[PDB]
Amino acid sequence: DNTISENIVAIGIAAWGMVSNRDTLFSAQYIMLYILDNNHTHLLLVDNGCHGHPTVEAKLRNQLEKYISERTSQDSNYGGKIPIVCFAQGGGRETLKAINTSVKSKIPCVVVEGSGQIADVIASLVTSSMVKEKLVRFLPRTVSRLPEEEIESWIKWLKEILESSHLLTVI
Amino acid sequence: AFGDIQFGKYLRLSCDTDSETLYELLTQHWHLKTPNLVISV
Amino acid sequence: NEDNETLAWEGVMKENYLVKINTKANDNSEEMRHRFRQL
Amino acid sequence: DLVNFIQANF
Numbered sequence: 618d619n620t621i622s623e624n625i626v627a628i629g630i631a632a633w634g635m636v637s638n639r640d641t642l643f644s645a646q647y648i649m650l651y652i653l654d655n656n657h658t659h660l661l662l663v664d665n666g667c668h669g670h671p672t673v674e675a676k677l678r679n680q681l682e683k684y685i686s687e688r689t690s691q692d693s694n695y696g697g698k699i700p701i702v703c704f705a706q707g708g709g710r711e712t713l714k715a716i717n718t719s720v721k722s723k724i725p726c727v728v729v730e731g732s733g734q735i736a737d738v739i740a741s742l743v744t745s746s747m748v749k750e751k752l753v754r755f756l757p758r759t760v761s762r763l764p765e766e767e768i769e770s771w772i773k774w775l776k777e778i779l780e781s782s783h784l785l786t787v788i
Numbered sequence: 789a790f791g792d793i794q795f796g797k798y799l800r801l802s803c804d805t806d807s808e809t810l811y812e813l814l815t816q817h818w819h820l821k822t823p824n825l826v827i828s829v
Numbered sequence: 830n831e832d833n834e835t836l837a838w839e840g841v842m843k844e845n846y847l848v849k850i851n852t853k854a855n856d857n858s859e860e861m862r863h864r865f866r867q868l
Numbered sequence: 869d870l871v872n873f874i875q876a877n878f
Contacts, residue, residue, distance in 0.1 A: 618837075618841050618844075621834065621837055621838055621841060622838065622841055624819075626819060626822060630801075633800060640791055640793065641789045641791075642789055642790075642791040644791060644792040644794075645791040645792075645793065646791075646792070646793055646794040646795060647793055647795060648795045649795060655793070655795050657796065658796040659796060659797070659798070659814075659818070660796065660798035661798070661799065661800070661801045662798065662799075662800035662801065663800075663801065663802075663803050664800055664801070664802040664803055665803040673803060676803070677801065677803055677805075677807075678827070680807045681807045681810075681811065682827060683807075684807040684808055684811060685811070685825065690821075690823065693823050699822070699823065699824070699825070700824050701825060701826075701827070702824075702825075702826045702827075703826070703827050703828075703829070704826060704827070704828040704829065705828075705829050706828070707829065711829070712829045715829040716829070719827075789878075790874050790878070799874060799877070800878075801877075802878070805877065809877070810877060813873055813877060817870055817873060
């Protein structure tokens with residue numbers, strides 16, 4: 618919609634295995650085990666695993682973001698570095714892993730919204746028993762499905778994220 | 789093998805590929821640098 | 830093609846107008862009863 | 869060219 622109305626730059630990073638259809642190629646064009654958007658200008662595919670449900674592109678994404686943090690920008694109004702912002706409106710294992718990886722670095726000051734998800738629980742939180750109780754009230758199906766060890770790991774991740782409130786902001 | 793699917797261009801990136809090299813190639817070949825960026829999860 | 834592009838642009842303007850009219854009603858009220866209820 | 873750069877990246 619915006620481009621129909623300087624061009625916007627969108628990069629979508631995913632895993633090759635997750636792609637349902639594989640095309641090999643001069644230029645090759647196709648018309649539309651996970652579907653992929655055809656609207657983003659740029660797309661990247663990882664080469665870690667084939668036909669694997671788990672996604673390994675998160676590590677490459679985090680490495681790219683960290684490198685972007687350590688960059689020079691003189692014409693910009695910043696102090697040489699390029700500002701970075703992370704959005705985590707959704708909730709889940711992948712979202713929390715990305716949050717932890719980003720917050721491990723200082724630059725990725727995370728900003729989150731109020732939509733119903735684990736991010737909402739994180740916003741509400743900003744000890745262990747209270748966090749666990751809040752997580753239980755967040756999603757009954759998600760907490761029930763998660764094993765006890767998985768729930769403990771989730772609570773540990775939430776505590777780690779809350780351990781650094783300086784870099785976290787919530788609308 | 790990379791391909792310019794039309795229905796933009798997409799190129800597969802190896803997990804072991806260096807971030808610096810791919811970023812430099814992308815900036816030099818495709819478009820200008822970004823004064824700001826946001827990553828959404 | 831071109832006609833479809835013009836229609837898509839018109840739909841974008843329609844979405845903008847719908848957003849504007851929707852926010853007009855919300856902004857009309859000068860009292861923030863939500864804040865009072867939260868308090 | 870672009871093709872050579874893509875091949876090198878691969």
